[PDB]
Design a protein around this ligand. Structure first.
Ligand SMILES: CC#CC1=Nc2ccc(NC(=O)Cc3ncc(Oc4ccnc5cc(OC)ccc45)cc3OC)cc2C(C)(C)O1
Length: 298
């Protein structure tokens, strides 16, 4: 359902700005919302809306997404829904908290040179570098977000570092650009049947049987871990994404360890990549595991 008394935000109280992500039919825009949260307070927000080319079907899909985000609720590691513009005579707009640093994939890749496994040096004390603690922390935060989302009976279907955002104080948030990404222009999406699917993140039961579950999200999570500990590299490097790739993956062929991983983190990847979906760990198990890794790290 949609409770307008709670979620409806007047279009006039929203000041639209620069594009944040653009698709063919959808887009995410930066905006200035007046009193969306705390009474009479300006706040930077990100708005998802449709663009030229979009049809009634994309409009329907955007309303479903808004209703799903309403149903989800608040969690520190899930992008937070602030409101919506659903009234006639204007476009449908889904408003969320702004995440300053953008997607995790671009962010890690940009900071790849500023990576030091451990900050042991006394001179390095006052420098904003990426450490193994930071990477384990992001991995653990995504798992807490995915555990929360699992408890809400949701399935993501496109978990990847491109769908993780970085906010202030190293807080990561799960998101879904969806229509705000041009998948027909994007290389992470490969043509399979009548659609463009994120093949490199998909579990084998999804590539062949089109079966999406919380455990197939765990597989994607394993691929996301590879993205994190590769510092934003593209999965399966040098591999042609075709029928031979799909065949080998079902047989048990896995990715090699990324250049910045710890043996245990690659083991956690391998566990997430177990062929049988029931044998892959749960998000609740990954929270405790990654939580222990972060406590041992200190
Ligand atoms: C189990 C499970 C699960 C599960 N989890 C979800 C989590 C999130 C969503 N949808 C969204 O977040 C919509 C959305 N995504 C990214 C958006 O882009 C941004 C925002 C904030 N800051 C951004 C800064 C930026 O550059 C600096 C650039 C972009 C940004 C906006 C935006 O809405 C407006 C959907 C789901 C579904 C699939 C329903 O399921």
């Amino acid at each position: 359902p949609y409770d307008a008394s709670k979620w409806e935000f007047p279009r006039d109280r929203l000041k639209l700005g620069k594009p944040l992500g653009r698709g063919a039919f959808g887009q995410v825009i930066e905006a200035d919302a007046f009193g969306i949260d705390k009474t009479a307070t300006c706040r930077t927000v990100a708005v998802k809306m449709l663009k030229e080319g979009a049809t009634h079907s994309e409009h329907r899909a955007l309303m479903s997404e808004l209703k799903i985000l309403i149903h989800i609720g608040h969690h520190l590691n899930v992008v937070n829904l602030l409101g919506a513009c659903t009234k006639p005579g204007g476009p449908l707009m889904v408003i969320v908290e702004f995440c300053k640093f953008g997607n995790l994939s671009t962010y890690l890749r940009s900071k790849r040179n500023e990576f030091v496994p451990y900050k042991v040096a006394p001179e390095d004390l006052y420098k904003d570098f990426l450490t193994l603690e930071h990477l384990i922390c992001y991995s653990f935060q995504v798992a807490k977000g995915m555990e929360f989302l699992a408890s809400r009976k949701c399935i993501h279907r496109d978990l990847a570092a491109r769908n993780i955002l970085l906010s202030e104080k190293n807080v990561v948030k799960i998101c879904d650009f969806g229509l705000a990404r041009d998948i027909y222009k994007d290389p992470d999406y490969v043509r399979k049947g009548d659609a463009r699917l994120p093949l490199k993140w998909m579990a084998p039961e999804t590539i062949f049987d089109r079966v999406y579950t919380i455990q197939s999200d765990v597989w994607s999570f394993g691929v996301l871990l590879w993205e994190i500990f590769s510092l934003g590299a593209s999965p399966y490097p040098g591999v042609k994404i075709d029928e031979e790739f799909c065949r080998r993956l079902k047989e048990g062929t896995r990715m090699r360890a990324p250049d910045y991983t710890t043996p245990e983190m690659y083991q956690t990847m391998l566990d997430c990549w177990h062929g049988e979906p029931s044998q892959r760990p749960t998000f609740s198990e990954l929270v405790e595991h990654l939580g222990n890794l972060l406590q041992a790290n200190a």
